[PDB]
Structure 1
Amino acid sequence: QTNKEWWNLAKNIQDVKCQQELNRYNDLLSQAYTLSLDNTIRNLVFKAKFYSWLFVINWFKAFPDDFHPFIPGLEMK
């Protein structure tokens, strides 16, 4: 359940044993959620809406930094 960006970057991640250590290199692997889109007038409003919905959902989600279920970890690796 991962994107090709993760496995490519996961292949570049070496010398890690604990998921906590992988929990340290979190934002480095966060690039797999690029979500590329155009800069059209319609897409820009949609992009703003998506970003607002994601930010507002995370506050209600309130998951701890160790629990990153939305970001694949060392198990998939």
Structure 2
Amino acid sequence: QTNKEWWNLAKNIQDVKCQQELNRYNDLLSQAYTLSLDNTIRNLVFKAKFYSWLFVINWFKAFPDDFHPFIPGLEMK
């Protein structure tokens, strides 16, 4: 359940044995969340609404940087 963007970054992360170490490559692998979208009026308003909703719903999710269900780790690799 990964994408091409994550896999391209995954091959180049070598000499990694434990998920703890791979936990330090979290925002680097978070770049697989490109969410490519235009900057039109509808998309810009939608982008603002969606990113604000993601910020507030990550507050209620309240997961630490160790437990990241939505950022693929050593299992997928």
Aligned-partner Cα distance in 1 for 2:65–2:39? 32
Aligned length in residues? 77
Q: CA deviation at 1:3?
A: 1.1
Q: CA deviation at 1:55?
A: 0.3
| Percent identity over paired residues | 100
1:12-71 deviation digits (Å, cap 9, x = unpaired): 110000100000111111100000111100110000010011000000000111001010
Secondary structure class of the residue paired with 2:43 = helix
Q: TM-score normalised to the size of structure 1?
A: 0.97
Aligned-partner Cα distance in 2 for 1:28–1:64? 16
Question: What 5-or-longer segments of structure 1 have no aligned partner?
Answer: none
Question: What 5-or-longer segments of structure 2 have no aligned partner?
Answer: none
Secondary structure class of the residue paired with 2:38 = coil
Runs of 4+ residues over 2 Å off in structure 1: none
Tell me which residue corresponds to 2:16: 16
Secondary structure class of the residue paired with 1:51 = helix
Q: TM-score normalised to the size of structure 2?
A: 0.97
